[PDB]
Design a protein around this nucleic acid. Structure first.
Ligand code: MG
Ligand code: MG
Ligand code: MG
Ligand code: MG
Ligand code: MG
Ligand code: MG
Ligand code: MG
Ligand code: MG
Ligand code: MG
Ligand code: MG
Ligand code: MG
Ligand code: MG
Ligand code: MG
Ligand code: MG
Ligand code: MG
Ligand code: MG
Ligand code: MG
Ligand code: MG
Ligand code: MG
Ligand code: MG
Ligand code: MG
Ligand code: MG
Ligand code: MG
Ligand code: ZN
Lengths: 124, 84, 99, 150, 138, 208
RNA sequence: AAAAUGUAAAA
RNA sequence: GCCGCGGUAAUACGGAGGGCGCGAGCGUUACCCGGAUUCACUGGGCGUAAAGGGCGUGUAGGCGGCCUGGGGCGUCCCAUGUG
């Protein structure tokens, strides 16, 4: 485009679309479970992923993933939503922070425990 | 959803139960994963066509497989070993 | 120093006033290229002497009314209807832009 | 003999009824560290024999690198096909800040401090072929005032 | 219709030089000259001279090159490897003295018309003057 | 705080012999003299041809483990080196040596920088008069690095300053073995030091 | 002249 | 995080041993610039990859051949005020 065309028109400033509106941009959002179930994975893989529909304090209602082996999430349980999709699960764009509110840390977790919310096991 | 086998199925199943327990438990494992909610589940559901058509297929251990039929309660196991 | 600009008269339709079109230039702050932008000014002509076409100097002044914050300085060269055209014509072209 | 250090080794392949027969290729660089670099690429049914041909081929083609305190005389951009590369002399204390490939070369060429950037098809081969052809065009105030006699 | 005479010429040279032509002409202009009167006074061209084609003032520019070479394709290297028109009629490029190009780092030359004449990066800096940055050469 | 924990082990991983220990790393066992291979249960297996990264990393972890200093500080230094006009690689080393806990070692007083840190820290040392307990303190040129009264008469101080009798200090340092003194003459140059490290590659690391 | 489709496990 | 890993021998899952990095911190989410010469002035393009207007005539606007002279707005320079 000629220098004059630029002067007239101009270059188009890009724009990014929040790949996940945990609303108010906030790093996290509290919310209450409404449904908790086991959904199958996408294309190549096969499993029985654990997820939950959540009522956010941000008005919205989104599905969330529950990381780790096993959980204690029922219906009216409060949880903290984290945000991060799952290239395997349709429409799951938020993770649940284990060990916050009614969200229990993974039982018997002994490795990467910062994630999974597991206190340092007091070796007896 | 009552379970129903048949000739080639019970015999197919007995051989599994009396030749290898690794696949016996794996087989009935899905049967419970289905018996409740068919189609969707484990293994790797996938509607079949032609020879089977009305029959469904659950990927098991690659080569092996299990074919069935769903009908408002009452499942129907048809096969346990062999591809398709 | 009271700012002083030079432009042509494009409207004498007012009583004791005139519209002056003042061009100016500058390089585009990102694409070098010099560019021309313009603006009209309403000057106080108490003597109603400067007519259409006249190119004059405008001098910052004490407020005459709303809009009128400029007095005519002195004539520069009468008869420039050639430029008033470039105006009227550019103006008239608007009608070919609406719906 | 010189330093010798290969950049990449890939396994291409062709199709032939009954299957696909393969063939590997390695891009090797070579030099002392005084300003003598060589770029060689060799294909052959096996890895070892490839780096070999790469060696032999490399040496059989090199460049006079007019180093000057380890830097370079000037800055140049050279575009070999779809790939492009910029070299910019940097005072001592810098270091060679270049891509894997445009570096694996500049070292065996005896380059100390140099600023660089790969623009365009970052593909190894061509970017490599591009840097060589680059150095191969550097000139000292010597080479210059010579071509400008009277 | 010639939008920019100058750019034309620098392009004429570049074009001839690639074929290894001994000479080439180009419509006369005082300004056109003073430019050539530097490619010369810098060893880029052997020189120039006001000829006359059809009674139309041209300038025969005699191109300087390098020595033949060994190996495939013996074509010599060139005196003018890169000639480029900076300031264009569509985007004039004026520069203050404090910001005058360091063409090719010492090697290259930058030409520029100033209210003191058609100097060069050095000569321009030597007088402490800036101006329209005409072109770069090396 | 500082590393702490197994050391004639890094001597190992780094592949190069490191005088991180003290006098033991001189006997017939910097642990390295016996198992010249890296730690862990795989130390002795054909290592894979190290990646350009590996190189710059190891080469830097080498230079840092030597002076045994925090990655935080180490980095902070380099950054200041690129700040001032001087061939960075050199000036970096130059500023690394200007540390108090280092000079104290380079000067003699301690067997290893490690022990030395403990020295400087415990107020056993002093500069141009009053004492300092800050390992990182930047020793300037013409600074008198001595010991203190309460410290002059100490078993360890003796033994060390003793074996120094006869030794030669660095070309950028002096030493009054008697009065337990020593001066930071000038800032060491590249030659004067000789660490088994390529200042270049460490620059290249922090330029990724 | 006219003649269709395709058995589901990618190392 | 992406490419992807798991159907009996998994350095990719979970535990252990060992290892690497950093250290009163280390990880995580969110947002910004970077990489992105991926809006390209520096610094991109349009025959087939995304991209020539179906073609003309022409308004505004943008651009302008050789010589001499006047003004000196742009432009360059110095001083000075301010910053
Ligand atoms: Mg994420
Ligand atoms: Mg996908
Ligand atoms: Mg039916
Ligand atoms: Mg190209
Ligand atoms: Mg690309
Ligand atoms: Mg950087
Ligand atoms: Mg098929
Ligand atoms: Mg296993
Ligand atoms: Mg992993
Ligand atoms: Mg693992
Ligand atoms: Mg594991
Ligand atoms: Mg980068
Ligand atoms: Mg950008
Ligand atoms: Mg551009
Ligand atoms: Mg197309
Ligand atoms: Mg079209
Ligand atoms: Mg149309
Ligand atoms: Mg037309
Ligand atoms: Mg027109
Ligand atoms: Mg003109
Ligand atoms: Mg004139
Ligand atoms: Mg002026
Ligand atoms: Mg000022
Ligand atoms: Zn040791």
């Amino acid at each position: 485009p000629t220098i004059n065309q630029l002067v007239r028109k101009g270059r188009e400033k890009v724009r990014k679309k929040s790949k996940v509106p945990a609303l108010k941009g906030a790093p996290f959002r509290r919310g209450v479970c409404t449904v908790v179930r086991t959904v199958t994975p996408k294309k190549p893989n096969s499993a029985l992923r654990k997820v939950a529909k959540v009522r956010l304090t941000s008005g919205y209602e989104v599905t969330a993933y529950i990381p780790g082996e096993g959980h204690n999430l029922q219906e009216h349980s409060v949880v903290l939503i984290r945000g991060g999709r799952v290239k395997d699960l349709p429409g799951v764009r938020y993770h649940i922070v284990r060990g916050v509110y009614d969200a229990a840390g993974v039982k018997d977790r002994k490795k990467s425990r910062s994630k999974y919310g597991t206190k340092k096991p007091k070796e007896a | 959803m009552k379970l129903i086998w048949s000739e080639e199925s019970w015999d197919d199943y007995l051989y599994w139960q009396e030749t290898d327990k690794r696949i016996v438990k794996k087989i009935n494992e899905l049967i419970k994963d289905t018996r409740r909610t068919p189609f969707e589940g484990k293994g790797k559901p996938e509607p079949l066509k032609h020879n089977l058509s009305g029959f469904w297929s659950r990927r098991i251990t690659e080569e092996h497989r299990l074919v069935y039929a769903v009908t408002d309660d009452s499942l129907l196991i048809a096969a346990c070993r062999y591809h398709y | 120093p009271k700012k002083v600009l030079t432009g042509v008269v494009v409207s004498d339709k007012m009583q004791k006033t005139v519209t002056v079109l003042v061009e100016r230039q500058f390089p585009h702050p990102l694409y070098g290229k010099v560019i021309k932008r313009s603006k009209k000014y309403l000057a106080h002509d108490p003597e109603e002497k400067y007519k259409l076409g006249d190119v004059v100097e405008i001098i910052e002044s004490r407020p005459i009314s709303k809009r009128k914050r400029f007095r005519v300085l002195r004539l520069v060269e009468s008869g420039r209807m050639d430029l008033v055209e470039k105006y009227l014509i550019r103006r008239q072209n608007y009608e070919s832009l609406s719906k | 003999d010189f330093e010798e250090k290969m950049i990449l080794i890939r396994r291409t392949a062709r199709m032939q009824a009954g299957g696909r027969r393969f063939r590997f290729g390695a891009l090797v660089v070579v030099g002392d560290r005084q300003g003598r670099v060589g770029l060689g690429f060799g294909k052959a049914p096996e890895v070892p024999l490839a780096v070999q041909k790469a060696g032999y081929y490399a040496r059989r083609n090199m460049v006079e690198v007019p180093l000057q305190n380890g830097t370079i005389p000037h800055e140049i951009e050279v575009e070999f096909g779809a790939s492009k590369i910029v070299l910019k002399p940097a005072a001592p204390g810098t270091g060679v800040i270049a891509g894997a490939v445009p570096r694996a070369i500049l070292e065996l060429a005896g380059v100390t401090d140099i600023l660089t950037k790969e623009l365009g098809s970052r593909n190894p081969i061509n970017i490599a072929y591009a840097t060589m052809e680059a150095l191969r065009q550097l000139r000292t105030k010597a080479d210059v005032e010579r071509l400008r006699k009277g | 219709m010639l939008t920019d005479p100058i750019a034309d010429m620098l392009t004429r040279i570049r074009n001839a030089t690639r074929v290894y032509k001994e000479s080439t002409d180009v419509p006369a202009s005082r300004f056109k000259e003073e430019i050539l009167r530097i490619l010369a006074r810098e060893g880029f061209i052997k020189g120039y001279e006001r000829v006359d084609v059809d009674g139309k003032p041209y300038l025969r520019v005699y191109l300087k090159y390098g020595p033949r070479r060994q190996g495939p394709d013996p074509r010599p290297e060139q005196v003018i490897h890169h000639i480029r028109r900076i300031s264009k009629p569509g985007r004039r490029v004026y520069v203050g003295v404090k910001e005058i190009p360091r063409v090719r780092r010492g090697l290259g030359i930058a030409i520029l018309s100033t209210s003191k004449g058609v100097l060069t990066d050095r000569e321009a800096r030597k007088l402490g003057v800036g101006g329209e940055l005409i072109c770069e050469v090396w | 705080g500082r590393y702490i924990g197994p050391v004639c082990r890094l001597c190992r991983r780094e592949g190069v012999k490191l005088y991180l220990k003290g006098e033991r790393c001189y006997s017939p066992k910097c642990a390295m003299e016996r198992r010249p291979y890296p730690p862990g249960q795989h130390g002795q297996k054909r290592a894979r041809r190290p990646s350009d990264y590996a190189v710059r990393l190891r080469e830097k972890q080498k230079l840092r483990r030597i002076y045994g200093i925090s990655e935080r500080q180490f980095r902070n230094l380099f950054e200041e080196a690129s700040k001032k006009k001087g061939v960075t690689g050199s000036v970096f080393l130059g500023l690394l040596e200007s540390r108090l806990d280092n000079v104290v070692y380079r000067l003699g007083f301690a067997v290893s920088r490690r022990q030395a840190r403990q020295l400087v820290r415990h107020g056993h040392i002093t500069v141009n008069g009053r004492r300092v307990d800050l390992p990182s303190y930047r020793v300037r040129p013409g600074d008198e690095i001595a010991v203190a009264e309460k410290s002059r008469n100490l078993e360890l101080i003796r033994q060390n300053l003793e074996a120094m009798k006869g030794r030669k200090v660095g070309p950028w340092l002096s030493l009054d073995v008697e009065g337990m003194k020593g001066k930071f003459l000038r800032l060491p140059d590249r030659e004067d030091l000789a660490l088994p490290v390529n200042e270049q590659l460490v620059i290249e690391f922090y330029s990724r």
